mmCIF file of C-alpha atoms and ligand atoms in Angstrom:
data_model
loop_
_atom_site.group_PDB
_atom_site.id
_atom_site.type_symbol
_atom_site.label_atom_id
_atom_site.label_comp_id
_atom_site.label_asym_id
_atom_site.label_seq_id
_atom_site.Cartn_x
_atom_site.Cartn_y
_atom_site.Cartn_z
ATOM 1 C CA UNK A 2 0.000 0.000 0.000
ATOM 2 C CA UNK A 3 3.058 2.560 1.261
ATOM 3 C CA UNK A 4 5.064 0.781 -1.679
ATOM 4 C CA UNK A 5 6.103 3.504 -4.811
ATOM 5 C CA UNK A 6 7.836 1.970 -7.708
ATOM 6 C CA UNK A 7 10.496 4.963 -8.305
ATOM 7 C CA UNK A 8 12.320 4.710 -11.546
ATOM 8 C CA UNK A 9 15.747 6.816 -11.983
ATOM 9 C CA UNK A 10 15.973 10.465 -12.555
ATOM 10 C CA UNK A 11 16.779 10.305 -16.516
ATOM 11 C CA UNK A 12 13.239 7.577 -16.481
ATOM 12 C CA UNK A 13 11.323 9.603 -14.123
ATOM 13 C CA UNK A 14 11.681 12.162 -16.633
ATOM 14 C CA UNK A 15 11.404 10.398 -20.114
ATOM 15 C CA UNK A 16 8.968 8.466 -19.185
ATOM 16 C CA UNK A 17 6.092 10.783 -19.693
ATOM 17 C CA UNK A 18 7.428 11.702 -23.439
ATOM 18 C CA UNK A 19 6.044 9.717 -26.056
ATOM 19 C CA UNK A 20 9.042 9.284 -27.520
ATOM 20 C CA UNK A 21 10.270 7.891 -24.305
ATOM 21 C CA UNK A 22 12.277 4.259 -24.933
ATOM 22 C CA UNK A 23 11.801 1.510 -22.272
ATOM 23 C CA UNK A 24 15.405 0.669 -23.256
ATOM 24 C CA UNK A 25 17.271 -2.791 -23.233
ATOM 25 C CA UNK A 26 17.320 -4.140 -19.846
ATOM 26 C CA UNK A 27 14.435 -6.499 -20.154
ATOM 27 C CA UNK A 28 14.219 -6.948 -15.936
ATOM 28 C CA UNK A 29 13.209 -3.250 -15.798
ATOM 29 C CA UNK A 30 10.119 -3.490 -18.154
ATOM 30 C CA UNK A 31 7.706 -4.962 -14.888
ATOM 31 C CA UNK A 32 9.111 -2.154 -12.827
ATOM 32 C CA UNK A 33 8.000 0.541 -15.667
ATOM 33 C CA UNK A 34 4.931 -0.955 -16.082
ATOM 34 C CA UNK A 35 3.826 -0.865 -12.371
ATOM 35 C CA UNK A 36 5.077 2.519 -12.453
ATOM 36 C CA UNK A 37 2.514 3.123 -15.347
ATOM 37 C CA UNK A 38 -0.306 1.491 -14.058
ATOM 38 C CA UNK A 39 0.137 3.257 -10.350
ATOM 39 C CA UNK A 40 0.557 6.914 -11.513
ATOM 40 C CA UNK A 41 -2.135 6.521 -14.334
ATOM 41 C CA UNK A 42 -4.077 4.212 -12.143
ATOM 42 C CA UNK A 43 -4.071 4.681 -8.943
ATOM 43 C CA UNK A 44 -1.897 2.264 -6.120
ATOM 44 C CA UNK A 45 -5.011 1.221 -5.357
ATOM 45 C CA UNK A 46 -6.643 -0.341 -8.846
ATOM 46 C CA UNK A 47 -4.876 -3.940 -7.968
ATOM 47 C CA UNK A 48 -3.036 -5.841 -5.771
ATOM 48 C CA UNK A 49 0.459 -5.684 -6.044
ATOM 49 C CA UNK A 50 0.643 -9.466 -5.901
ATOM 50 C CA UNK A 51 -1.786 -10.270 -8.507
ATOM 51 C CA UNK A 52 -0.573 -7.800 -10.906
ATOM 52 C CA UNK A 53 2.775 -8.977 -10.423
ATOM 53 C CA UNK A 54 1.723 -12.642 -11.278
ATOM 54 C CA UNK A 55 -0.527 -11.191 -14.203
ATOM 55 C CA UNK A 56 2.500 -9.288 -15.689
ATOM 56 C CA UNK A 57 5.078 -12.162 -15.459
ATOM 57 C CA UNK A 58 2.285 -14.781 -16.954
ATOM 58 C CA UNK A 59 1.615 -12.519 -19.918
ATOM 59 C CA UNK A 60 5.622 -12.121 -20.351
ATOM 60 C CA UNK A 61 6.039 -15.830 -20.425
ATOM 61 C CA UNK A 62 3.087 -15.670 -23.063
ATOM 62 C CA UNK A 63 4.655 -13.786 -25.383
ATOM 63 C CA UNK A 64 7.208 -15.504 -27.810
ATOM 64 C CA UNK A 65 10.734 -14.832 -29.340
ATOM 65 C CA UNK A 66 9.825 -13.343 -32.348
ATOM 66 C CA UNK A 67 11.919 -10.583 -33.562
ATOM 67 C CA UNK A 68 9.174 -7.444 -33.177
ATOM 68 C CA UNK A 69 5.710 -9.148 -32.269
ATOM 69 C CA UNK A 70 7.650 -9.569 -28.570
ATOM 70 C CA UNK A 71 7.594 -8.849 -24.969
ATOM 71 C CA UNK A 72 9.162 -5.070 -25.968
ATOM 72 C CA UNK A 73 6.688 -4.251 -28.287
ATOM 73 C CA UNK A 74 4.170 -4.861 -25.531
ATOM 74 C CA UNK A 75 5.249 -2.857 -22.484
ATOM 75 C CA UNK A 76 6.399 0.190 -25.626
ATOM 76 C CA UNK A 77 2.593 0.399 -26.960
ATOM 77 C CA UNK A 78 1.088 0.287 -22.946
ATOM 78 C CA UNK A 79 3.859 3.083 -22.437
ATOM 79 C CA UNK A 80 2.145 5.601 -25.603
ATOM 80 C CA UNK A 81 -1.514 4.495 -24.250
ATOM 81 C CA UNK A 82 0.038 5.717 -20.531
ATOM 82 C CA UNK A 83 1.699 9.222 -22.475
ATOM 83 C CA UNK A 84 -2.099 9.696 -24.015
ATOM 84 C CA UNK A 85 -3.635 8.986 -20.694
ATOM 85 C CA UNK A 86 -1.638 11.411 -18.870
ATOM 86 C CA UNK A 87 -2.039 13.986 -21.440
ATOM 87 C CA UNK A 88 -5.775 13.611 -21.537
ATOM 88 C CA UNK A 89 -6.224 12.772 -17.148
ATOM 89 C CA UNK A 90 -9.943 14.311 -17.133
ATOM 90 C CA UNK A 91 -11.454 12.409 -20.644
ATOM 91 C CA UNK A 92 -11.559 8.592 -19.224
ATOM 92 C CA UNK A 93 -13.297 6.599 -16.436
ATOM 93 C CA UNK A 94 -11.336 4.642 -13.953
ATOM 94 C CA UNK A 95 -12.438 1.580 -15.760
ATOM 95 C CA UNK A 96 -11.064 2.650 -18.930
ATOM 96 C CA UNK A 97 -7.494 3.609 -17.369
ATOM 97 C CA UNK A 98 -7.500 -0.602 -15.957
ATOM 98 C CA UNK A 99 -8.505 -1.936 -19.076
ATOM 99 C CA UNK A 100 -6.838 0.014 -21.585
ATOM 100 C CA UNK A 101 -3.279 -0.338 -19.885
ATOM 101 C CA UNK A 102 -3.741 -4.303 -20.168
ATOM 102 C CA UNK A 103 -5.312 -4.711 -23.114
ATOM 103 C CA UNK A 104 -1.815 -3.024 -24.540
ATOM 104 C CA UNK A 105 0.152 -5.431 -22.719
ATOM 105 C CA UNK A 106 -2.080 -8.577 -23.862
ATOM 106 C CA UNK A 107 -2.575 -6.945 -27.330
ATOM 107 C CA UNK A 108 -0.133 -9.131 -29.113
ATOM 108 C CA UNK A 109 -0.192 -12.435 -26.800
ATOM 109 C CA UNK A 110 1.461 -15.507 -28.120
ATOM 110 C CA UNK A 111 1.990 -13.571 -31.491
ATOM 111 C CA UNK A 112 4.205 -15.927 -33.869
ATOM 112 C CA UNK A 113 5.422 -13.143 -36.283
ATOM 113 C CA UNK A 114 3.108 -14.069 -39.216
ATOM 114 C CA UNK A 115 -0.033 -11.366 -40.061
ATOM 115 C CA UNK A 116 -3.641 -13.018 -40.623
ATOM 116 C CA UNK A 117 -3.085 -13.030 -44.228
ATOM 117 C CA UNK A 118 -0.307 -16.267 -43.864
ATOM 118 C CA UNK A 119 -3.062 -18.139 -41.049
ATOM 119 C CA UNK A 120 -6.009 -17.676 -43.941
ATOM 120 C CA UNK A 121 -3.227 -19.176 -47.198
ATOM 121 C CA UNK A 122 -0.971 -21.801 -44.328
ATOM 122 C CA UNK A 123 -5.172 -22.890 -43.004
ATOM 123 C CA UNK A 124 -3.900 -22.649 -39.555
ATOM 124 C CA UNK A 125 -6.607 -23.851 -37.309
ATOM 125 C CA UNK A 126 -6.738 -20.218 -36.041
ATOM 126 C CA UNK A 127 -8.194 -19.401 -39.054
ATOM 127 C CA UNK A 128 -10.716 -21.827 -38.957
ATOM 128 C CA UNK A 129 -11.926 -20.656 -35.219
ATOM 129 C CA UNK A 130 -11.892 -17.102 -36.408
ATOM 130 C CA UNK A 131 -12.724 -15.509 -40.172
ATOM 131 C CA UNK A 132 -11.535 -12.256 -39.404
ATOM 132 C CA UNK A 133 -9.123 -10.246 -37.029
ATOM 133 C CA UNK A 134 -8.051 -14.144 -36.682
ATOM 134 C CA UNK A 135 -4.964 -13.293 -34.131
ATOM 135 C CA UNK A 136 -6.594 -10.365 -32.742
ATOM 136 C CA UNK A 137 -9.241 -12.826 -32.018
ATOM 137 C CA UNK A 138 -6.660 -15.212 -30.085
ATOM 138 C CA UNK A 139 -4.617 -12.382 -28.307
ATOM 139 C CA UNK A 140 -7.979 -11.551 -26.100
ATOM 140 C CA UNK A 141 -8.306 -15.361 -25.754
ATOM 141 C CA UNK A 142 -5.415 -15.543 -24.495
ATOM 142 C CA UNK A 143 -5.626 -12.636 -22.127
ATOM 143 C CA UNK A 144 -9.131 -14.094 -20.483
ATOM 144 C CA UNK A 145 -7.114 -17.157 -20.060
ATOM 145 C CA UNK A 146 -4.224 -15.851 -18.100
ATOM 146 C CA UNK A 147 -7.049 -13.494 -16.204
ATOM 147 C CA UNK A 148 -8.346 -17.002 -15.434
ATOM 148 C CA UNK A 149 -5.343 -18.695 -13.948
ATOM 149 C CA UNK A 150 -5.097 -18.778 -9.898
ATOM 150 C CA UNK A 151 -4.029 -15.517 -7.866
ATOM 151 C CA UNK A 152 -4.197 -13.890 -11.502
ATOM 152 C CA UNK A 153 -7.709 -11.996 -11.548
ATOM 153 C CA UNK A 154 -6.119 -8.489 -11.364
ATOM 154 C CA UNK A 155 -10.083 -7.659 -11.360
ATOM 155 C CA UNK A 156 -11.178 -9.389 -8.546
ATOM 156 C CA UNK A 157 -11.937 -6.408 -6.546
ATOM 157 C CA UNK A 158 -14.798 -4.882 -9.198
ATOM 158 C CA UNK A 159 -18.896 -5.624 -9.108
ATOM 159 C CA UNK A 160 -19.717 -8.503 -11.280
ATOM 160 C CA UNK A 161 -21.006 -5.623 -14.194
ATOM 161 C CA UNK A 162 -17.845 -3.499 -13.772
ATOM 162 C CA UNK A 163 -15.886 -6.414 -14.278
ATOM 163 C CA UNK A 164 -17.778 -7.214 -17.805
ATOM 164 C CA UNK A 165 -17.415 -3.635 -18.705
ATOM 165 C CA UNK A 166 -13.682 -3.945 -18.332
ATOM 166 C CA UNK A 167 -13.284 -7.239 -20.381
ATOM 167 C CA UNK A 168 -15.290 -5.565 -23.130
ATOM 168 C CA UNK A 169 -13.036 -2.654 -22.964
ATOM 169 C CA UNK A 170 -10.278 -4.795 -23.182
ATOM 170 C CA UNK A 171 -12.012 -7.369 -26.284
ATOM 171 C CA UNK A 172 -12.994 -4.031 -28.614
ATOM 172 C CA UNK A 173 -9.116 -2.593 -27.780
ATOM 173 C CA UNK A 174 -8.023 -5.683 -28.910
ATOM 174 C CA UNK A 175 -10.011 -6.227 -31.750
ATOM 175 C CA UNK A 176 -8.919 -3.064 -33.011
ATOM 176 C CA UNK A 177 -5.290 -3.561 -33.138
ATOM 177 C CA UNK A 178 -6.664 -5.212 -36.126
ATOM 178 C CA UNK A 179 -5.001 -2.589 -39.235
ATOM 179 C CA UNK A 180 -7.289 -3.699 -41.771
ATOM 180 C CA UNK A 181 -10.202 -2.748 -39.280
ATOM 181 C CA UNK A 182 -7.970 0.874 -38.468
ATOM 182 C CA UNK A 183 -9.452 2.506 -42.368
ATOM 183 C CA UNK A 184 -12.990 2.627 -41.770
ATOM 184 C CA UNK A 185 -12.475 2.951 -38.183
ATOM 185 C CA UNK A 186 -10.745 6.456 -39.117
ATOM 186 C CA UNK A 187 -12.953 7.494 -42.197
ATOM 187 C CA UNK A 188 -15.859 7.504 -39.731
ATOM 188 C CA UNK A 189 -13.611 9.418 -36.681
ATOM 189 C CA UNK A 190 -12.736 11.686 -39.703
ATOM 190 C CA UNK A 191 -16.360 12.698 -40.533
ATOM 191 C CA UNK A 192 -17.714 12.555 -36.977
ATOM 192 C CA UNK A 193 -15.363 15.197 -35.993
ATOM 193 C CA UNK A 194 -15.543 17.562 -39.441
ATOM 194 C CA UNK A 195 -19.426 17.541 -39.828
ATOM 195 C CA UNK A 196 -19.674 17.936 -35.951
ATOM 196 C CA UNK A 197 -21.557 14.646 -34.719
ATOM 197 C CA UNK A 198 -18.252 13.273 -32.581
ATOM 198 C CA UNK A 199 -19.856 13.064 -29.083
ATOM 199 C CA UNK A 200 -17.536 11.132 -26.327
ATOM 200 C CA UNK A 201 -21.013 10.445 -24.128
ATOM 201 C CA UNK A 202 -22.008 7.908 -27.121
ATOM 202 C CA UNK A 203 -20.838 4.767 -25.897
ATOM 203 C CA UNK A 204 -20.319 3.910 -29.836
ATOM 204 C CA UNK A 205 -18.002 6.995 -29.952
ATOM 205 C CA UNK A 206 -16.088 6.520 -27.270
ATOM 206 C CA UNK A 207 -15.109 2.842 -28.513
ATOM 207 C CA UNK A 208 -14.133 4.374 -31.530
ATOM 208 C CA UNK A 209 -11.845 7.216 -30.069
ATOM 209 C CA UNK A 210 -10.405 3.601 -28.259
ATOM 210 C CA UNK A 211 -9.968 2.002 -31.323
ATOM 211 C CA UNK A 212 -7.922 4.670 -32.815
ATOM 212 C CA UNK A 213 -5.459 5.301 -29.881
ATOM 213 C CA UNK A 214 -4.886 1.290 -29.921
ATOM 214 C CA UNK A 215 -4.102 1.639 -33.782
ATOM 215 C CA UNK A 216 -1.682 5.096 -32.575
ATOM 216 C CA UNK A 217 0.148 3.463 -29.532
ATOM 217 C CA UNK A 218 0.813 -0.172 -31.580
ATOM 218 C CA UNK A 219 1.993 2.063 -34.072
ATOM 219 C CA UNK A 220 4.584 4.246 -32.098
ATOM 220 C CA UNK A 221 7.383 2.843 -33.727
ATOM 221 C CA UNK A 222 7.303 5.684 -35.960
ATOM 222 C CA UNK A 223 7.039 8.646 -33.589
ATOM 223 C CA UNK A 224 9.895 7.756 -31.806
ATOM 224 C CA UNK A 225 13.706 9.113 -32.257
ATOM 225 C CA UNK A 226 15.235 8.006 -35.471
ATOM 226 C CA UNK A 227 17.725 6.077 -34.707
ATOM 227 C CA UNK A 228 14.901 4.265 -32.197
ATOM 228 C CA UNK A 229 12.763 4.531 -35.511
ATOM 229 C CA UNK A 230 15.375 3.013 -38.077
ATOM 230 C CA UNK A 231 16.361 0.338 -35.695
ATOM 231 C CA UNK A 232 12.712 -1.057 -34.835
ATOM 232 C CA UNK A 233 12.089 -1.082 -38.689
ATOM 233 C CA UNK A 234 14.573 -3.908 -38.893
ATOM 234 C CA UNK A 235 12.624 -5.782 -36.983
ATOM 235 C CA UNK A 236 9.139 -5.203 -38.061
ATOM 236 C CA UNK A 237 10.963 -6.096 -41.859
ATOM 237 C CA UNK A 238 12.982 -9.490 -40.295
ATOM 238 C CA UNK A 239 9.377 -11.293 -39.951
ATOM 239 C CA UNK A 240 7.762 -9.381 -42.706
ATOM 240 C CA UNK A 241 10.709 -10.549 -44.725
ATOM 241 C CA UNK A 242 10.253 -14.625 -42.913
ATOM 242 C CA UNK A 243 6.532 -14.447 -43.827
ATOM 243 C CA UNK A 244 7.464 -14.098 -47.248
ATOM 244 C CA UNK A 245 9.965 -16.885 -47.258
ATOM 245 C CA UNK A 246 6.899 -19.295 -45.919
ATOM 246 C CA UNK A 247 4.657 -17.974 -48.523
ATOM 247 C CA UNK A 248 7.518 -18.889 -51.333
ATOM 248 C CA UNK A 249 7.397 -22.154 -49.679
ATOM 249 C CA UNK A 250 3.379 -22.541 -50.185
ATOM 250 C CA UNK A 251 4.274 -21.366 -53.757
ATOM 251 C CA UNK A 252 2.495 -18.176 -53.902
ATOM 252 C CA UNK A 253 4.954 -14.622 -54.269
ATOM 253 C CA UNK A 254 4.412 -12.354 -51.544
ATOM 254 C CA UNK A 255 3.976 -8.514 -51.265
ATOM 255 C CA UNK A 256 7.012 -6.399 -51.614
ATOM 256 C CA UNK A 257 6.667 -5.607 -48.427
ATOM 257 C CA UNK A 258 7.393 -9.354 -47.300
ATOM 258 C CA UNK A 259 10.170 -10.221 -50.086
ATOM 259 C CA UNK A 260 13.674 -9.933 -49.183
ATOM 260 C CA UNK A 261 15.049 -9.726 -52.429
ATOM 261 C CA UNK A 262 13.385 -6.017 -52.743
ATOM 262 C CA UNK A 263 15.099 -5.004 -49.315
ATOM 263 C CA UNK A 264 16.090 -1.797 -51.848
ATOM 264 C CA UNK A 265 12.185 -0.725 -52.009
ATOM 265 C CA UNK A 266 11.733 -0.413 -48.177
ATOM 266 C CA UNK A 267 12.492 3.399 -47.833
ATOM 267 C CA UNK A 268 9.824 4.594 -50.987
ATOM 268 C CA UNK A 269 7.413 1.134 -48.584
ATOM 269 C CA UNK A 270 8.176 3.853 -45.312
ATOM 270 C CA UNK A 271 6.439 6.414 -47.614
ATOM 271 C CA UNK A 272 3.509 4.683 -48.423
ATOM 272 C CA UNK A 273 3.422 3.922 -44.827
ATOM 273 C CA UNK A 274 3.329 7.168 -43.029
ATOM 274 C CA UNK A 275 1.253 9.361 -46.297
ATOM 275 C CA UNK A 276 -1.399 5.550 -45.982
ATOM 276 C CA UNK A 277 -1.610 4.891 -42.226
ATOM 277 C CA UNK A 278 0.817 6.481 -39.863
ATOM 278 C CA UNK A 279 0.029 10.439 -40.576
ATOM 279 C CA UNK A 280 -3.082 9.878 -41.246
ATOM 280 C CA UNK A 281 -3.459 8.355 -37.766
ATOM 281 C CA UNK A 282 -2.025 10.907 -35.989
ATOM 282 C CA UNK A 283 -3.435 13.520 -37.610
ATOM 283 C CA UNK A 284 -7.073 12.796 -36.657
ATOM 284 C CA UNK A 285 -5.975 11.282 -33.523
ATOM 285 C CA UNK A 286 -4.524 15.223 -32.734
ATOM 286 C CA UNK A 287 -7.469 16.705 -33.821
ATOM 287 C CA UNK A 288 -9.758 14.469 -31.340
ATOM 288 C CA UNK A 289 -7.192 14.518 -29.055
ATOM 289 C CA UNK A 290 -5.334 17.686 -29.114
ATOM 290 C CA UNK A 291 -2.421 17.078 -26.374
ATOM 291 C CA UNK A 292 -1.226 14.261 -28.721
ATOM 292 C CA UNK A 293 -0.160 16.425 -31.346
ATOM 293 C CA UNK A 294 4.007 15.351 -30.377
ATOM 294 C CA UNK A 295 2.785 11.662 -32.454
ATOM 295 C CA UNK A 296 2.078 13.896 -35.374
ATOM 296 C CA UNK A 297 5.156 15.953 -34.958
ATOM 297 C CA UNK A 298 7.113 13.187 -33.752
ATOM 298 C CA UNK A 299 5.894 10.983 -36.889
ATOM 299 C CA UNK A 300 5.772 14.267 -39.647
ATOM 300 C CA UNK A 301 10.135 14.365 -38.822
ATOM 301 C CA UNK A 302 10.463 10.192 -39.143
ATOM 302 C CA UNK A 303 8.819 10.908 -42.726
ATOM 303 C CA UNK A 304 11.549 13.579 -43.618
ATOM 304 C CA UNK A 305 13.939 10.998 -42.105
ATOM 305 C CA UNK A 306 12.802 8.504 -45.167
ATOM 306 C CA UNK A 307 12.216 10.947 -47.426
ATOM 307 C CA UNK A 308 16.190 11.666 -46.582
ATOM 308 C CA UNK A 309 17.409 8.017 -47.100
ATOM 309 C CA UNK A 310 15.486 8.104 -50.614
ATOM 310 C CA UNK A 311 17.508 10.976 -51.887
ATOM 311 C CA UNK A 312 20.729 9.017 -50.552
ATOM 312 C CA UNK A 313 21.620 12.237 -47.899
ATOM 313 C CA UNK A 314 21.818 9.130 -45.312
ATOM 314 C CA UNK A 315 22.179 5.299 -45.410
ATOM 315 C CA UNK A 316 20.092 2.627 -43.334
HETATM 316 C C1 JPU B 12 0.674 -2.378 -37.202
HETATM 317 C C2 JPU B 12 1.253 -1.973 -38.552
HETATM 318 C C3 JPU B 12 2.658 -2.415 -38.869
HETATM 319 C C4 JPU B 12 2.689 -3.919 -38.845
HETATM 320 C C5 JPU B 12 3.462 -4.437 -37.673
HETATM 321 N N1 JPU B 12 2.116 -4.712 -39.732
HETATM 322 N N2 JPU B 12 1.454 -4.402 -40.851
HETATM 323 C C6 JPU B 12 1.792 -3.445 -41.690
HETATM 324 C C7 JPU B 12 0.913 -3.264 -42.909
HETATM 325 C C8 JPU B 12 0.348 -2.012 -43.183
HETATM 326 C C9 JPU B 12 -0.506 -1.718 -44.242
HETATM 327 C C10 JPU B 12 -0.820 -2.708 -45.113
HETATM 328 O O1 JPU B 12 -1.587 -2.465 -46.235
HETATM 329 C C11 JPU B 12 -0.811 -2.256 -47.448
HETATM 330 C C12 JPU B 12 -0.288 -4.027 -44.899
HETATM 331 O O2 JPU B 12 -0.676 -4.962 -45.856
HETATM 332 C C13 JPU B 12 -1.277 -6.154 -45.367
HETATM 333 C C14 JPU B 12 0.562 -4.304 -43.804
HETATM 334 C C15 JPU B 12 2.948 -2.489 -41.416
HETATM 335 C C16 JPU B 12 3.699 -1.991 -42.499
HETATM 336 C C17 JPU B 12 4.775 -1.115 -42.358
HETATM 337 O O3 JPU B 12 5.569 -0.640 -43.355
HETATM 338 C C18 JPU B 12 5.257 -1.082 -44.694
HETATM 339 C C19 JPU B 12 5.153 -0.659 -41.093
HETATM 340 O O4 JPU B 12 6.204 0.218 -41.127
HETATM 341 C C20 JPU B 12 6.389 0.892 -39.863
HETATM 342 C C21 JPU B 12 4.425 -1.089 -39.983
HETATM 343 C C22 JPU B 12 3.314 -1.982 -40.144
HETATM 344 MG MG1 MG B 13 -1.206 -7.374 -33.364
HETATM 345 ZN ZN1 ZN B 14 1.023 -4.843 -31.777
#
């Protein structure tokens, strides 16, 4: 009750940038997370013991993939804490639990391979769920772990609260799916231009969730750019091993996935940010206005590219 995680100075102070790095010593990510969770939170949402169990179960859970990994996790909770703490007065208490966790479960027992390979290998995945087939798993897995003995971080909550929670946590999940992200957007887009956005609608507010999951699993790009650069090698290392397994099932993959056009990932980058990332941000700022460092943070990483293209730096 009386016991404050306390990170370093140079952490204390990072942390609440969004471009803030949880850095390479693995047996500080728990500590960071805690950290998270109590000043976002409260010291009060769960028991210390629980969560600590929770947090070390979903580690476990999470495989050793080259980006789809226990890093990626506790990075995309840390942007949902940075748009929490910019935005203290616009969410429940309920939405500050769930929201936190379903960023650390978001990816569970990933194996590096998108939906797309499941649907063309027929993984039995893909016959359990049609669509947002991992997504699908990933909150299966997280109700599972919830599930497990000295584990139910939610114990403390009214039988109704608790169901709110876990369907805050499904829809967050479920909309870590990209090819859901478009429409999801389009609609944010003409909600908020035509007037109509209103965060009492129940319907709105999932969407406004929906978008920050699809902003904070994609704050690889509105990082630092040497953080930037060096993540994008491993987002490409299993794009480029999905593509060797869909050689193997004799079918040519995307670009994007083939390492023999490793030369057409900088003009890919493009695509990227003008398609998805800015595009993201950009209504994401103008629902959210104290998020507007993403944009900025995501607008330089685009110049960055744009630089490697013209040769005026190497990768
Ligand atoms: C969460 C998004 C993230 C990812 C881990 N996986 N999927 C795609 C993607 C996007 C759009 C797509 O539509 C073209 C697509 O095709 C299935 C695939 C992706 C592509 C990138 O660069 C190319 C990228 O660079 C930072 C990051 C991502
Ligand atoms: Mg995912
Ligand atoms: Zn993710």
């Amino acid at each position: 009750g009386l016991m404050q995680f306390t990170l370093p100075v140079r952490l204390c102070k990072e942390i609440e940038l969004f471009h803030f790095d949880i850095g390479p010593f693995e047996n500080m990510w728990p500590g960071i997370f805690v950290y998270m969770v109590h000043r976002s939170c409260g010291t009060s949402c769960f028991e210390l013991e629980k969560l600590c169990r929770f947090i070390m179960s979903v580690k476990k859970n999470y495989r050793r993939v080259p980006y789809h990994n226990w890093k990626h996790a506790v990075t995309v909770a840390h942007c949902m804490y940075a748009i929490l703490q910019n935005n203290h007065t616009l969410f429940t208490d309920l939405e500050r639990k769930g929201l936190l966790i379903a960023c650390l479960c978001h990816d569970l027992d990933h194996r590096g391979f998108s939906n797309s390979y499941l649907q063309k290998f027929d993984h039995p995945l893909a016959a359990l769920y049609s669509t947002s087939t991992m997504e699908q798993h990933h909150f299966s897995q997280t109700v599972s772990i919830l599930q497990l003995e000295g584990h139910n971080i939610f114990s403390t909550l009214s039988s109704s609260e608790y169901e709110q929670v876990l369907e805050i946590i499904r829809k967050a999940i479920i909309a870590t799916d990209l090819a859901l992200y478009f429409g999801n957007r389009k609609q944010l887009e003409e909600m908020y231009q035509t007037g109509s956005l209103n965060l009492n609608n129940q319907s709105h507010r999932d969407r406004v969730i929906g978008l920050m999951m699809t902003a904070c699993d994609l704050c690889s790009v509105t990082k630092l750019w040497p953080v930037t650069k060096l993540t994008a090698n491993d987002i490409y290392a299993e794009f480029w091993a999905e593509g060797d397994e869909m050689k193997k099932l004799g079918i040519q993959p995307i670009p994007m996935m083939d390492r023999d056009k490793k030369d057409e990932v900088p003009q890919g980058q493009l695509g990227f940010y003008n398609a998805v990332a800015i595009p993201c941000y950009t209504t994401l700022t103008q629902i959210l206005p104290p998020t507007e460092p993403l944009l900025k943070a995501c607008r330089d990483n685009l110049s960055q590219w744009e630089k490697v293209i013209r040769g005026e730096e190497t990768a």
